[PDB]
Amino acid sequence: GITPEQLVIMSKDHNSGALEQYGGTQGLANLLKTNPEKGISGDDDDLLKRKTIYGSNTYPRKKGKGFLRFLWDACHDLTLIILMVAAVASLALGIKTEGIKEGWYDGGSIAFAVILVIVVTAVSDYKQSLQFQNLNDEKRNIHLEVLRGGRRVEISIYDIVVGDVIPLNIGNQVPADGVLISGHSLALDESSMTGESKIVNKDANKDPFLMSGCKVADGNGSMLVTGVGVNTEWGLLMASISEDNGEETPLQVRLNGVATFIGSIGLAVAAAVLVILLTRYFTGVIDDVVKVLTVAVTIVVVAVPEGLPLAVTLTLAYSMRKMMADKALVRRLSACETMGSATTICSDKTGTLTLNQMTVVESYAGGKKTDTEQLPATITSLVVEGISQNTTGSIFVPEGGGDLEYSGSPTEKAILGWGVKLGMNFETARSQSSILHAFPFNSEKKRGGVAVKTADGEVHVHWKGASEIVLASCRSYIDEDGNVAPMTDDKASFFKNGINDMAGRTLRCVALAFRTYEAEKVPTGEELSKWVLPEDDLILLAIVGIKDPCRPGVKDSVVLCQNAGVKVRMVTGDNVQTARAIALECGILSSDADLSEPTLIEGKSFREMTDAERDKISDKISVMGRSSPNDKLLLVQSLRRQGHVVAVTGDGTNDAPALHEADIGLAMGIAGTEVAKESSDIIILDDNFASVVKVVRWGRSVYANIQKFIQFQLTVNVAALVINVVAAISSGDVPLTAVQLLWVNLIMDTLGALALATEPPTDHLMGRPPVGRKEPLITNIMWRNLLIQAIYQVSVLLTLNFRGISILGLEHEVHEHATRVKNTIIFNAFVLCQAFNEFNARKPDEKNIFKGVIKNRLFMGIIVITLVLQVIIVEFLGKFASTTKLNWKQWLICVGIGVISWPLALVGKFIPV
Ligand SMILES: [Mg+2]
């Protein structure tokens, strides 16, 4: 018909490309039923047609927690699945073995383990998700008139449809993709969508293309909307990020591997025991096979780590809470760890690593650079009056007394920030001075002039403009702390060289001058516009250079990140020169190999290569300018294909694909766009890089704590498996009942995990490089430690299980009572050995300092008191553990058996054996 989605092609094509084939912006009128006076026909069918054919501006919104989804995700844990199958088996087998079919104590503990895991994960993730939903919800959209025949004024941005001409002013936000149909020096801030720091100047013929989700930095004009909804570049980017799948955290896969290994070992050994013992029974209605089967499922239960999911969830939740105590928010528990293993960090430039606000970086004043610092009073007074009386923009709340917020174009904002830094107060600066005449900033005439009648009789003429023309129009200057001085040829050459060097860097160049011409008044003149405002013999005050600078204290953070083995690179859509300058300032890119192709490549060069040939180079890309969002996605994909655990810190919508495809996507809390924050696993509410370093440290500490608990849990499981298997083959009885060890796993894990988690992160973790993504979760040192502890426990508990009635005093006064007492001694000595092994694991690979934290002591007291209560009283607690009362001598024997763990733990720590 007439632009049936050909308009998406028009926008896709190069700037000012393919728009001439359609007759230009005006030719596009009468197409899409657009009239410059009437953007919409009077009827509503004329709007429904645009809603249907060209779509609607509403973007679909993702929905989470639809129906207990997080509980299902928790249930999908592989180790948890092993636990569920073992739990069902044991419950049915025991309930048939006893035949009572009353109560749920036999499998109650094993069911409660997974129930607790599910509940804890669901609660923690629900809280985190709702908190993130509340925080990230930012009303960036600004509702405005649509300007179509003066009808349906002030409709929400979601009601704008293709074919209607909407107006845009300074500070507004471009709602939908469009082409400007008229304007007055309009200029957009596309840094959100394209990543270019400098504002883009839009013309009705040169660059007639306005992008959705853009901030109008300067000027104003009316624009025809072309793309709305998914058809927009914003919409298309949001569409190319929806699909998420094939993800598994390195920690998650490592835990799955360890759980699968231990579970397979347990299953194999239990099956061997079952087969051998059945052969013994048959040859060595029901034939007592049920008792053997309950023994076998008990062995299988003690084999698998029941409390591992509980401990990992508790550690991740505690570390997420501690991170949120800092100014970094983690969306999911798993992410809390994945950032520790990150091997490279790709950081946006505009918004991330740079304030994104133009401000003065250097300056000139009194014949000297005198960058920032504090200017002399004599020159400072004139400079501040000129900055106050020659700027259209103004500070938001000088009268109110709150934090100052600047307005106007980035040039005006930076000049005003400089004036404020110099000690200017806008309320008073504007006072004591009346603007007789004001010729504002003009594209035709670069300079901007003003006439200020100071409180004194004489009147000043201020000129703020481009450095070259202002300098050419001035023949004198105000030297430091002194009166006017003629500018000699050498001084003019010095100023011009300074301006040229300043322009060599990314920063722009704005110069201020003042002429003391007086004795005449603009009001006395018949017409203010007729005031020539003479431009001759000006006196230069201070040349000022304004650029988008690196965030404060970002170079040091990058230095720390690099020291931690985590390389940092920059992926940005800004031109190569600006990216190179900002990288050098921020420390990402060192001085050497600055211009080499691998060190910095443009987006087009990177994408030209095949996905196979985008990998031999992706390992060296330190900077990347003019990179499209798909090029950021390609870089992330290539880095991941090479085995990197890529983190991406970005703010704009262009970074959304890179954030999503990345292993760990970090998004700035305030600067970040809604799309970037949605696709990020962590959103940095600090808007700072020190928070990123802290997050890396917290992830490494989380991994260390998980490793320590894994050591402890493997010790417990491998001691109990041996004890039960040997006891079953030797006599057919299991000392460690299923419920006893289920309680041990549950309580000891849920308490010791957080007890070790109390260890605050230490800078030591930053010294070592990141984990290799392939090293086993259980390092050989942890294997030796857990093996030594498990061997000791096996030895003591087996010698007890076999000779305890004789070894323990008061031997066999009643055989059943003596057997129960011996089993209780074995069980609670096992518990105490586990507690003291937790003590050891708190500070591994060194001599224990034996100085715990208050919370650790409190939880040790809790463990001791709960164990003592469980053993000592058999009613309402200890019924299921089947434990008989113990006398003081027996309890002393148990605490001695536990204490013996510490010396051998130390010996194993200090001996490679
Ligand atoms: Mg950005």
Swiss-Prot record:
Transmembrane segments: 67-87, 106-126, 256-275, 293-310, 707-725, 737-757, 778-800, 816-837, 856-877, 888-909
SMART domains in UniProt: Cation_ATPase_N
Domain notes: The N-terminus contains an autoinhibitory calmodulin-binding domain, which binds calmodulin in a calcium-dependent fashion.
Stretches of the chain found on the membrane's Extracellular side: 88-105, 726-736, 801-815, 878-887
This protein's record includes keyword NADP: no
Similarity comment: family membership: Belongs to the cation transport ATPase (P-type) (TC 3.A.3) family. Type IIB subfamily.
Gene Ontology biological process terms in this record: response to nematode
The EC number(s) this enzyme carries: 7.2.2.10
UniProt subcellular location: Cell membrane
Reaction(s) this enzyme catalyzes, per UniProt: Ca(2+)(in) + ATP + H2O = Ca(2+)(out) + ADP + phosphate + H(+)
Known regulation of activity: Activated by calmodulin.
Ranges facing Cytoplasmic side: 127-255, 311-706, 758-777, 838-855
Keywords on record: ATP-binding, Calcium, Calcium transport, Calmodulin-binding, Cell membrane, Ion transport, Magnesium, Membrane, Metal-binding, Nucleotide-binding, Translocase, Transmembrane, Transmembrane helix, Transport
Species: Arabidopsis thaliana (Mouse-ear cress)
Active-site residues, as the UniProt record annotates them: D348 (4-aspartylphosphate intermediate)
NCBIfam families with a match to the protein in the record: ATPase-IIB_Ca, ATPase_P-type
Protein name: Calcium-transporting ATPase 8, plasma membrane-type
Described function: This magnesium-dependent enzyme catalyzes the hydrolysis of ATP coupled with the translocation of calcium from the cytosol out of the cell.
Enzyme class: translocase
Alphabetized PROSITE patterns for the sequence: ATPASE_E1_E2
Listed GO CC annotations: plasma membrane; plasmodesma; plastid
Lineage of source species: Eukaryota, Viridiplantae, Streptophyta, Embryophyta, Tracheophyta
Coiled-coil boundaries: none
